[PDB]
Short mmCIF file of all heavy atoms in Angstrom, two decimals:
data_model
loop_
_atom_site.label_atom_id
_atom_site.label_comp_id
_atom_site.label_asym_id
_atom_site.label_seq_id
_atom_site.Cartn_x
_atom_site.Cartn_y
_atom_site.Cartn_z
N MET A 1341 68.40 0.76 -7.81
CA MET A 1341 68.41 -0.63 -7.37
C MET A 1341 68.54 -0.74 -5.86
O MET A 1341 68.10 -1.73 -5.28
CB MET A 1341 69.53 -1.41 -8.07
CG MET A 1341 70.92 -0.97 -7.71
SD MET A 1341 72.15 -1.91 -8.62
CE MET A 1341 73.63 -1.15 -8.00
N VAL A 1344 64.66 0.19 -5.13
CA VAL A 1344 63.59 -0.43 -5.95
C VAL A 1344 62.79 -1.34 -5.02
O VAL A 1344 62.98 -2.55 -4.93
CB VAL A 1344 64.15 -1.13 -7.19
CG1 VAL A 1344 65.20 -2.20 -6.85
CG2 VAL A 1344 63.02 -1.72 -8.03
N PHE A 1352 55.64 -0.51 -6.95
CA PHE A 1352 56.85 -1.31 -6.98
C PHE A 1352 56.99 -2.03 -8.32
O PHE A 1352 58.06 -2.03 -8.93
CB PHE A 1352 56.83 -2.32 -5.83
CG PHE A 1352 57.61 -3.57 -6.11
CD1 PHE A 1352 59.00 -3.54 -6.11
CD2 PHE A 1352 56.97 -4.76 -6.37
CE1 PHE A 1352 59.72 -4.69 -6.37
CE2 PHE A 1352 57.68 -5.91 -6.63
CZ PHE A 1352 59.06 -5.87 -6.63
N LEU A 1356 59.55 -1.71 -11.50
CA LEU A 1356 60.08 -2.87 -12.21
C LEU A 1356 60.07 -2.65 -13.72
O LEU A 1356 61.08 -2.88 -14.39
CB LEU A 1356 59.31 -4.13 -11.83
CG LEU A 1356 59.44 -4.59 -10.38
CD1 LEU A 1356 58.52 -5.75 -10.13
CD2 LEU A 1356 60.88 -4.98 -10.06
N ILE A 1377 73.83 -6.79 -5.56
CA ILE A 1377 72.66 -7.52 -6.04
C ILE A 1377 72.70 -8.94 -5.51
O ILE A 1377 71.65 -9.56 -5.29
CB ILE A 1377 72.57 -7.46 -7.57
CG1 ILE A 1377 73.63 -8.34 -8.23
CG2 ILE A 1377 72.73 -6.03 -8.05
CD1 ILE A 1377 73.42 -8.52 -9.71
N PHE A 1378 73.91 -9.45 -5.24
CA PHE A 1378 74.07 -10.78 -4.67
C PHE A 1378 73.31 -10.92 -3.36
O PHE A 1378 72.46 -11.80 -3.21
CB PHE A 1378 75.55 -11.07 -4.45
CG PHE A 1378 75.79 -12.27 -3.60
CD1 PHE A 1378 75.58 -13.54 -4.11
CD2 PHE A 1378 76.22 -12.14 -2.29
CE1 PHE A 1378 75.80 -14.65 -3.33
CE2 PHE A 1378 76.44 -13.25 -1.51
CZ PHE A 1378 76.23 -14.50 -2.03
N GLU A 1379 73.57 -10.03 -2.40
CA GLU A 1379 72.88 -10.15 -1.13
C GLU A 1379 71.46 -9.62 -1.19
O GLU A 1379 70.65 -9.99 -0.33
CB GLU A 1379 73.66 -9.44 -0.02
CG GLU A 1379 73.72 -7.94 -0.14
CD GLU A 1379 74.98 -7.49 -0.82
OE1 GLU A 1379 75.58 -8.30 -1.55
OE2 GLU A 1379 75.38 -6.32 -0.63
N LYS A 1380 71.11 -8.78 -2.17
CA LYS A 1380 69.71 -8.39 -2.20
C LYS A 1380 68.83 -9.47 -2.81
O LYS A 1380 67.61 -9.43 -2.61
CB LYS A 1380 69.48 -7.07 -2.94
CG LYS A 1380 69.73 -7.13 -4.41
CD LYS A 1380 69.45 -5.78 -5.06
CE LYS A 1380 70.54 -4.78 -4.72
NZ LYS A 1380 70.37 -3.49 -5.44
N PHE A 1381 69.39 -10.43 -3.55
CA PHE A 1381 68.58 -11.61 -3.84
C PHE A 1381 68.78 -12.73 -2.84
O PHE A 1381 67.91 -13.59 -2.71
CB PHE A 1381 68.82 -12.16 -5.27
CG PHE A 1381 70.12 -12.92 -5.47
CD1 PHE A 1381 70.26 -14.24 -5.03
CD2 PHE A 1381 71.17 -12.36 -6.16
CE1 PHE A 1381 71.44 -14.93 -5.22
CE2 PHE A 1381 72.34 -13.06 -6.37
CZ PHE A 1381 72.47 -14.35 -5.90
N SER A 1382 69.92 -12.76 -2.15
CA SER A 1382 70.22 -13.87 -1.25
C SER A 1382 69.76 -13.57 0.18
O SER A 1382 68.94 -14.30 0.73
CB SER A 1382 71.72 -14.17 -1.27
OG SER A 1382 72.44 -13.28 -0.45
N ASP A 1390 61.44 -11.62 1.45
CA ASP A 1390 62.07 -10.31 1.35
C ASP A 1390 62.94 -10.14 0.11
O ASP A 1390 62.79 -9.16 -0.63
CB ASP A 1390 62.88 -10.04 2.63
CG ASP A 1390 64.02 -11.04 2.84
OD1 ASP A 1390 64.17 -11.97 2.02
OD2 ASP A 1390 64.76 -10.88 3.83
N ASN A 1391 63.83 -11.10 -0.15
CA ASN A 1391 64.82 -10.94 -1.20
C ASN A 1391 64.29 -11.26 -2.58
O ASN A 1391 65.01 -11.06 -3.57
CB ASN A 1391 66.03 -11.83 -0.90
CG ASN A 1391 65.63 -13.23 -0.48
OD1 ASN A 1391 64.45 -13.58 -0.52
ND2 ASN A 1391 66.60 -14.03 -0.08
N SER A 1392 63.04 -11.73 -2.68
CA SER A 1392 62.46 -12.10 -3.97
C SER A 1392 62.43 -10.93 -4.95
O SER A 1392 62.39 -11.15 -6.16
CB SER A 1392 61.04 -12.63 -3.76
OG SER A 1392 60.30 -11.78 -2.90
N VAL A 1393 62.47 -9.70 -4.44
CA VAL A 1393 62.59 -8.53 -5.31
C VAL A 1393 63.89 -8.60 -6.10
O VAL A 1393 63.94 -8.24 -7.28
CB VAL A 1393 62.48 -7.24 -4.48
CG1 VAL A 1393 61.06 -7.05 -3.99
CG2 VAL A 1393 63.43 -7.28 -3.29
N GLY A 1394 64.96 -9.07 -5.46
CA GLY A 1394 66.22 -9.22 -6.16
C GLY A 1394 66.14 -10.24 -7.28
O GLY A 1394 66.63 -10.00 -8.38
N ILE A 1395 65.49 -11.37 -7.02
CA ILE A 1395 65.33 -12.38 -8.06
C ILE A 1395 64.49 -11.84 -9.21
O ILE A 1395 64.81 -12.06 -10.39
CB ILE A 1395 64.72 -13.67 -7.47
CG1 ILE A 1395 65.65 -14.31 -6.43
CG2 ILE A 1395 64.39 -14.66 -8.56
CD1 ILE A 1395 65.46 -13.83 -5.01
N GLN A 1396 63.42 -11.11 -8.89
CA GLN A 1396 62.57 -10.55 -9.94
C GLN A 1396 63.35 -9.56 -10.80
O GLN A 1396 63.25 -9.58 -12.03
CB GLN A 1396 61.34 -9.89 -9.33
CG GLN A 1396 60.49 -9.13 -10.34
CD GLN A 1396 59.55 -10.03 -11.12
OE1 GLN A 1396 59.69 -10.18 -12.34
NE2 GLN A 1396 58.60 -10.64 -10.43
N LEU A 1397 64.15 -8.69 -10.16
CA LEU A 1397 64.90 -7.72 -10.95
C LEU A 1397 65.98 -8.40 -11.78
O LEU A 1397 66.26 -7.98 -12.90
CB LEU A 1397 65.49 -6.64 -10.04
CG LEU A 1397 66.50 -6.93 -8.92
CD1 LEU A 1397 67.94 -7.02 -9.42
CD2 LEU A 1397 66.38 -5.89 -7.82
N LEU A 1398 66.59 -9.47 -11.24
CA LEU A 1398 67.55 -10.23 -12.03
C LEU A 1398 66.90 -10.82 -13.27
O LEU A 1398 67.44 -10.72 -14.38
CB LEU A 1398 68.16 -11.35 -11.19
CG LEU A 1398 69.05 -10.98 -10.01
CD1 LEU A 1398 69.43 -12.23 -9.24
CD2 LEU A 1398 70.28 -10.24 -10.48
N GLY A 1399 65.72 -11.42 -13.11
CA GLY A 1399 65.02 -11.96 -14.26
C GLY A 1399 64.65 -10.90 -15.27
O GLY A 1399 64.77 -11.10 -16.48
N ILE A 1400 64.19 -9.74 -14.79
CA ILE A 1400 63.77 -8.68 -15.68
C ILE A 1400 64.95 -8.14 -16.48
O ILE A 1400 64.87 -7.95 -17.70
CB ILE A 1400 63.06 -7.57 -14.89
CG1 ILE A 1400 61.71 -8.07 -14.35
CG2 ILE A 1400 62.87 -6.34 -15.75
CD1 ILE A 1400 60.79 -8.64 -15.42
N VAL A 1401 66.08 -7.89 -15.81
CA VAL A 1401 67.24 -7.38 -16.53
C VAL A 1401 67.82 -8.46 -17.44
O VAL A 1401 68.38 -8.16 -18.50
CB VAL A 1401 68.31 -6.83 -15.56
CG1 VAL A 1401 68.88 -7.93 -14.69
CG2 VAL A 1401 69.41 -6.10 -16.32
N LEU A 1424 71.56 -18.58 -5.21
CA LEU A 1424 70.32 -18.80 -5.94
C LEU A 1424 69.71 -20.16 -5.61
O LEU A 1424 68.49 -20.27 -5.44
CB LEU A 1424 70.58 -18.70 -7.44
CG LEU A 1424 70.98 -17.33 -7.99
CD1 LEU A 1424 71.34 -17.44 -9.45
CD2 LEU A 1424 69.80 -16.40 -7.84
N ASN A 1427 68.17 -20.04 -2.26
CA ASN A 1427 66.92 -19.29 -2.28
C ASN A 1427 65.80 -20.12 -2.88
O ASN A 1427 64.66 -20.08 -2.40
CB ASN A 1427 67.11 -17.99 -3.04
CG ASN A 1427 66.37 -16.83 -2.41
OD1 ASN A 1427 65.38 -17.03 -1.70
ND2 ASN A 1427 66.85 -15.62 -2.64
#
Side-chain angles (χ1 to χ4, degrees):
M1341 66 182 179
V1344 56
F1352 153 72
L1356 294 174
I1377 73 170
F1378 168 73
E1379 68 265 22
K1380 68 179 73 175
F1381 75 78
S1382 81
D1390 62 358
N1391 46 6
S1392 47
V1393 289
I1395 297 89
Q1396 173 81 245
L1397 61 83
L1398 294 174
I1400 292 305
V1401 65
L1424 294 174
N1427 219 335

